[PDB]
Amino acid sequence: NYSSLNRAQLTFEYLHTNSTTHEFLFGALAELVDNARDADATRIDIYAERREDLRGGFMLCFLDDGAGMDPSDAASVIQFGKSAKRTPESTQIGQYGNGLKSGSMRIGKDFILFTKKEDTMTCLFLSRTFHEEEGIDEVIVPLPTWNARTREPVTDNVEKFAIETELIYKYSPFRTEEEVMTQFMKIPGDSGTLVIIFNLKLMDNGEPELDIISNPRDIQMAETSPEGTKPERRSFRAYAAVLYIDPRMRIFIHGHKVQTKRLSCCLYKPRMYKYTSSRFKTRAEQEVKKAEHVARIAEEKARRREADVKKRIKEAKQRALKEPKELNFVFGVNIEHRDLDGMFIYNCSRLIKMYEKVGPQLEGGMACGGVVGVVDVPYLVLEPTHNKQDFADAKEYRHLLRAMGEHLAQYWKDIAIAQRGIIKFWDEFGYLSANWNQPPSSELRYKRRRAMEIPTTIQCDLCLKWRTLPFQLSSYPDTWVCSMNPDPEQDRCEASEQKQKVPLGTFR
Amino acid sequence: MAFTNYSSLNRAQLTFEYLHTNSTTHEFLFGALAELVDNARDADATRIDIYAERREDLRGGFMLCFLDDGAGMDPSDAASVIQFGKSAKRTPESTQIGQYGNGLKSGSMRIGKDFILFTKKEDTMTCLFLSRTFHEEEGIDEVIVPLPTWNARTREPVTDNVEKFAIETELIYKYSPFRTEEEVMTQFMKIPGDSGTLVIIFNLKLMDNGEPELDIISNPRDIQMAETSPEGTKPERRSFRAYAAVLYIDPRMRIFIHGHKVQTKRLSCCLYKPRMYKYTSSRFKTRAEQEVKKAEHVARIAEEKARARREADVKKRIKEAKQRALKEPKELNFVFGVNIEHRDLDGMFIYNCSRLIKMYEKVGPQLEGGMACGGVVGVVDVPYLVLEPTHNKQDFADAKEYRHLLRAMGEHLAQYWKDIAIAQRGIIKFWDEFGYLSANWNQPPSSELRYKRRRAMEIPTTIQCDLCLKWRTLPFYPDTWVCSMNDRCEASEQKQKVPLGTFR
Ligand SMILES: Nc1ncnc2c1ncn2[C@@H]1O[C@H](COP(=O)(O)OP(=O)(O)NP(=O)(O)O)[C@@H](O)[C@H]1O
Ligand SMILES: Nc1ncnc2c1ncn2[C@@H]1O[C@H](COP(=O)(O)OP(=O)(O)NP(=O)(O)O)[C@@H](O)[C@H]1O
Ligand SMILES: [Mg+2]
Ligand SMILES: [Mg+2]
Ligand SMILES: [Zn+2]
Ligand SMILES: [Zn+2]
């Protein structure tokens, strides 16, 4: 019985240390968005309340209507590392167990979660302010659990509950049970979570680190974005537009839906190369081996159903001797924006590396001058880093970049636009100037010419199904729905999903 | 703290799975090893031998060790090694490179599955076996860590709870690479003096094929990356020898990799005509004033609560030193100098508190395609006020001000390039006379005799001692060298005066 031996413990100072992993504040917000997606939410409203007695001047909130949490799972939010998302496929982007505790502490000094599922209402006040102003070097976290209907306390230790509520009212932005209950009433259904991040991080001058008073329908970097600055890295709107490859959720920033785009959909002539990534053909067999000797580890762990779960994964990995034997590289020229190009790397639909030049693009010149690329890497070929902006395997990451470079060269010599004349190709679609970053011309005819090539896609708002309209609106674009769809067949909401056919090219 | 008995409220806890999550921060294995090297430097050690054993029954085939003769640790301080976040290295002038409290626990788990510390200070012998293997083979989830504390003279147990001691020794003998007590004591004898650490990292990570991630059977005097040498790869990012050569800006310690001293170099002086530019970063005095506004203020906050007192006096001591930090920090020092021996190895070599954090960072005209500033190198020692390091200590966690500094360095690099007047009189002719006579910019220098001498005349040659660790400037053998070879060990320290160029 290892009951007396020393145990590794956390401390107050570790929270800032954990926060330092995020050198990209949009990256920090992406963790809280990922948690919402993993909760199966269909709305992640990011409205920013305005409380001027808190550092920064405003509060950043995060509503949702996923599954929420219950007492045990909520308590397991302060159980650093513990993540039950380790399971077959099941996108569930979180695997490590510190994305909330690393994103909420890079944004503001404190953070107060509100959640409610089934018949429970749970608050998870974690505030560094408490620790600073009362000397606690551990990480103490109140956790009251009111009941959904009667809104009466539900816990065993009444003095614990009283103390918990006392801190929650004397430190949090809300100073009484009435206000806290009002916050709970902002989750209308019987499932959701309202993560709030009060006192914020101040830039040196004094203004907050997130700007909401320049473009009110947007969250932009408080630093004056100096030229350059590929549009995702200066606006949370643009970043969240391509923060997923398979968007089945709606992101209303400041009560305004983000025009989600699926990159690969909106491109000039796409060509989907099914590379086995040669290595990954081996690490399809070693993935079969990995899932074999990790299902064997699962058998060793089980020696029940978890091994059976991983055995069917192993059989599914022996099906990945077919299915994840090849990653899918989707090359397509981007006529509307030419300099916004480079590999758009996705690990399980969680865009990790962006605008990365691989192959001839590294060498200066029009060679692959505009080609975009996308690949969805599962959680077997590569894994992410702690910040989930880099991959923690340099060798095989560079292997994939080299592979993508060769296939990008093949795509370039397949489209043959250089043979027909790269200058003519880029001139006929509008770019008629010197600088390579010069934005397009408008001149009606050119807008139309660009428009014919790219097809139109628009997500619904009752079934969250994409469609293939010849026109466009929405549902900061204006509303539209499936019933209003001008189309003979794709008219109803019960109609089957449609996917674009992807023409294919072959390597070698 | 209790006050109203905060004893029932839930507390954030760690778990077994978090160790891998923490390990993931390091995407650079040399970066992982740098944490264990930094701990030794903070311990005032004058030797950080990285000899690798040959235990072949462990995964990987060998064990990676780290001996040193710094200050070691004691029972309490060693126990505070598993107190994630706790770090008493945040002190005025901060000669310690650690502030977070996470280098060992994040580097030892990127290298190998487990890690066993041995240490001995004053009259103590403390082992800190922390092995993921134990957790895996017994289902333990909260990270349990044995910690025996033998006495360093009698070699007898010194602890209260004998059952705890027996259990601790049992796991230490049943899981660690060495069984019994005699072997453990032999490991303790490897630390000869009365201060040191012998951090050991057994079972390793096994790159996919089966060979370990670290290569030690290609160049036995080097720990190379177990992977090919692609044509474009800066030497620091392939060889720990080259990485450790320029890991510090103020090397006052000897790094014997595989029982072989690393010829430590200071990039600040091994260059063609150097120029130190005294930029105030415009911001920096404003920033420096700003933290001096805060640092003094936040010093009152900790002092105000202690004003119950050791902290308050130290915060006051910090505050006067931070009042003096209204005088000392006003200008960083940008040291530009061309690198004739290797020109493709160029770019800003950023240092934060004498640790290297960013490597070969092209800024300014170098970002523009062309020979403009084609070879110029740069260095700056950023204090712990202007910028801070990231989780992995390879990026700075302030993008706005990091890019501000890079822009500033770009302008000053342009100024230096126009000041050396090398492009003014035939940059082709400059690189011609100093050896480069081929097509590619990356093509290595000429090797004919006269050109080697020509390169040699410009750059002076420095050499560290081996008794006082005092650098010398032998005017105008290589593995062992002392002061009386030039002119003596008691002689005053010598520093190269740096020519100064002014901005604007
Ligand atoms: N909006 C939410 N709805 C439901 N459960 C949630 C929500 N946010 C967080 N959780 C739970 O809290 C846990 C902790 O979240 P987080 O700190 O993001 O770690 P993770 O998501 O488990 N893994 P990672 O994202 O890799 O750190 C999650 O795994 C969920 O179990
Ligand atoms: N070789 C050593 N000699 C003496 N003390 C050591 C040594 N290695 C580690 N320690 C102690 O263990 C603590 C934890 O080390 P580490 O996990 O590296 O965090 P840190 O060194 O405190 N700060 P950081 O360098 O930012 O990680 C140190 O701060 C020292 O107190
Ligand atoms: Mg998560
Ligand atoms: Mg450290
Ligand atoms: Zn619909
Ligand atoms: Zn000497």
Task: Please tell me the number of Cα atoms within 13 Å of A60 on its side-chain side.
Answer: 28
CA distance B109 to B131: 10
Angstrom distance (rounded) from CA B12 to CA A82: 12
What residues contact residue B10 under an 8 Å CB cut-off, 6+ apart?
A: A75, A78, A140, A141, A142, A143
Pair A507, A273: CB distance under 8 Å: yes
Contact assessment for residue B146 and residue B78, using Cβ atoms and an 8 Å cutoff: no
The H or E element containing residue A48 is: strand A48-49
Residues 6+ apart with CB under 8 A from B210: none
CA distance to A320, B120, B149, B174, B189, per residue, from B155 (Å): 57, 12, 10, 20, 11
Q: What is the DSSP letter of A180?
A: H
Q: Which amino acid is at A185?
A: M
Chain B residues closer than 8 Å to A385 by CB: 24-25, 27
β-pair partners for A147? A120
Question: Nearest-CA neighbor of A257 among A461, A59, A63?
Answer: A461
DSSP label of A391: B
Residue A238 assigned to a binding site: no
* A435 has a chain B CB within 8 A of its CB: no
Strands (E), B385-482: 463-464, 471-472
Written in H, E and C, the secondary structure of A323-377 is HHHCCCEEEEECCCCCCCCEEEEEECCCCCEEEECCHHHCCCCCCCCCEEEEEEE
Cross-chain Cβ contact A157/B8 below 8 Å: yes
CA dist B395 and B388 (Å) reads 9
Integer CA distances (angstroms), A401 to A395, B194, B234, B235, in order: 10, 51, 18, 21
Cα distances (angstroms) measured from residue B330 to each of A257, B280, B284, B285: 47, 6, 6, 5
> What is the Cα–Cα distance from B412 to B403, expressed in whole angstroms?
14
**Per residue in B365-401, is it b (16+ CB within 10 Å) or e — as a string?**
bbeeeeebbbbbbbbbbbbbbbbbbbbbbbbbbbeeb
Residue A33 near ligand 1, beta carbon < 6 Å: no
Residues in chain B closer than 8 A to A125 (CB atoms): none
Ligand at shortest distance from the CA of A85:
1
Distances (CA, A) of A441 to A370, A449, A463: 17, 11, 37
Q: Which residues pair with B253 in a beta bridge?
A: none
Question: Domain coordinates of chain A in residue numbers?
Answer: 14-241, 278-325
Instruction: Report every protein residue that has its C-beta within 5 angstroms of ion ligand 5.
Output: A 460, 462-463, 482, 493
Structure token pair of residue B63: 């064990």
- Is B216 within 8 Å of B52 (Cβ atoms)? yes
Report the distance separating Cα A161 and Cα A177, nearest Å.
13
Which amino acid is it at A31? E
Q: For helices A417-428 and A394-415, what crossing angle results, to 10°?
A: 90
Pairing assessment for the beta strands A504-505 and A271-273 based on DSSP bridges:
parallel
- In chain A, which among 259-298 make CB contacts under 8 A with chain B? 283, 286
Question: With contact defined as beta carbons under 8 Å apart, do B191 and B118 qualify?
Answer: yes
> Domain A14-241, what fold?
Heat Shock Protein 90 (3.30.565)
C-beta of residue B221 within 8 angstroms of C-beta of residue B241:
yes
Has domain B18-245 been given CATH number 1.10.260? no
Q: Which residues of A49-66 are buried (b: 16+ CB within 10 A; e: fewer)?
A: eeeeebebbbbbbbbbbb
Is domain B267-280+335-458 given the CATH code 3.30.230 in the classification?
yes
SS3 B476: coil
**Quick check: helix, strand or coil at residue B466?**
coil
Does ligand 1 lie within 6 Å of residue A35's CB atom? yes
Residue B62 burial (CB count, 10 A)? 17
Query: Quick one: CA dihedral A311, A316, A321, A325, positive or negative?
Result: negative
Q: Which helix (H) or strand (E) holds B130?
A: strand B130-131
Cite the DSSP H helix spans in A39-99: 71-75
Other CB atoms within a 10 A radius of the CB of residue B478 amount to 7
In chain B, which residues have their Cβ closer than 8 Å to the Cβ of A396? 208
- The dihedrals phi and psi of A246, each to the nearest 5 degrees, come to -125, 70
CB B237 within 8 A of CB B347: no
Q: CA angle A467-A215-A451, nearest 5°?
A: 35
The Cα A445–Cα A449 span in angstroms is 6
Scored b (16 or more CB within 10 A) or e, A243-253 reads: bbbebebbbbb
Residue labelled with tokens 């190379």: B224
Q: What DSSP string runs through A186-221?
A: TS-SSEEEEEEE-SBPBPTTSSBSEE-SSSTTS-EE
The CA distance from A8 to A135, in Å, is: 21
Please say whether the dihedral angle defined by the alpha carbons of residues A464, A469, A475 and A480, taken in this order, is positive or negative: negative
Q: What is the rounded CA–CA span in Å between residue B17 and residue A224?
A: 40
Taking the CA of residue A148 and the nearest CA in chain B, the distance in Å comes to 22
Q: Is A140 on the interface with B (CB under 8 A)?
A: yes
Would you give the end-to-end CA distance of chain A in angstroms? 61
Q: Whose CA is nearest to atom 15 of ligand 1?
A: A100
Q: CB–CB of B85/A11 below 8 Å?
A: yes
Cited resolution, angstroms? 3.2
Distance B101 CA to ligand 4 centre (A): 5
Residues 6 or more apart whose CB falls under 8 angstroms from that of B416 comprise B275, B277, B336, B373, B376, B501
Q: B148 Cβ partners below 8 Å, 6+ apart?
A: B126, B127, B157, B159, B165, B168, B169, B172
Are the Cβ atoms of A20 and B164 closer than 8 angstroms?
no
φ and ψ of B462, to 5 deg: -110, 160
Q: Which ligand is nearest to the CA of A195?
A: 1
Nearest to A456 by CA among A492, A422, A483, A490: A490
Q: State the Cα torsion B354-B360-B366-B371 to the nearest 10°.
A: 120
Instruction: Please state, in angstroms and rounded to a whole number, the distance separating the CA atoms of residues B45 and B436.
Output: 41
Tokens of A499: 């996917």
Residues 6+ apart with CB under 8 A from B327: none
CB atoms within 10 A of CB B440: 8
Instruction: Sort out which chain A residues have CB atoms less than 8 A from B386's CB and list them.
Output: none
Buried b (16+ CB within 10 A) or exposed e, A430-468: bbeeeeeeeebeeeeebeeebeeeeeebbbbbeeebbbe
- In angstroms, the Cα distances linking A200 to A105, A119, A129, A253 are 9, 32, 12, 18
| CA distances in angstroms from B140 to A9, A481, B17, B413, listed in the order given | 15, 53, 10, 55
Residue with tokens 């009433």: A185
CA A456, CA A433: separation in Å to the nearest integer? Answer: 28
Give B 160-199 residues with CB within 8 A of chain A: 161, 163-164, 167-168
Identify the burial level of B461 via C-beta atoms within 10 angstroms of its C-beta, where 0-12 means exposed, 13-18 middle and 19 or more buried: exposed
Measured distance CA(B8)–CA(B2) in Å, rounded: 10
Optimal mutation site among B5, B27, B81, B215, interface A, most CBs of chain A within 10 A: B27
Q: Is B62 on the interface with A (CB under 8 A)?
A: no
Q: Is B38 in the pocket of ligand 2 (CB under 6 A)?
A: yes
Distances from the Cα of A66 to the Cαs of A62, A194, B323, in angstroms? Answer: 12, 11, 52
Indicate whether residue B73 lines ligand 2 (CB < 6 A).
Answer: yes
Cα distances (Å, whole numbers) of residue A250 to A104, A332, A465, A493 = 21, 26, 11, 17
CA–centroid distance, A252 to ligand 4, in Å, is 42
Alpha helices in A157-304 (DSSP H): 158-170, 177-184, 236-241, 279-302
* Residue B274: CB atoms within 10 Å: 22
